Design a protein around this ligand. Structure first.
Ligand code: HEM
Length: 82
């Protein structure tokens, strides 16, 4: 099965206890990854609650970074909001 989240609910996760963001229509919970991210935590916090696909691709993440990102997926963006 697959869990779908709306933009409305995703935007609520942008505080000190929860950081979610969207990449290629998939929703990632990066709350616990903030301090481990090689690119710093500020880059992630600034995009929290929204779509960071362009920023993610603009920096050009490696294959290893992309494989690791998969472990943080919690669902997808509801089709109605795409
Ligand atoms: C899905 C979660 C993400 C993962 C797993 C991740 C992982 C990593 C890793 C492993 C690196 C080291 C270099 C590489 O392997 O490419 C990196 C660098 C970086 N990341 Fe991320 N990243 C994620 C999301 C993002 C997002 C959303 C942004 C920006 C909005 C961002 C901005 C950067 C920057 C600025 C660097 C530094 C690149 C440089 O040294 O020029 N990352 N990230």
């Amino acid at each position: 099965a697959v869990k779908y989240y709306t933009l409305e609910e995703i935007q609520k996760h942008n505080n000190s206890k929860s950081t979610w963001l969207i990449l290629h229509y998939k929703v990632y919970d990066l709350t616990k990854f903030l301090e481990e991210h090689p690119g710093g935590e500020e880059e992630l916090r600034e995009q929290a609650g929204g779509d960071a696909t362009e920023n993610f691709e603009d920096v050009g993440h490696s294959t290893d970074a992309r494989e690791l990102s998969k472990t943080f997926i919690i669902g997808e963006l509801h089709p109605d909001d795409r």
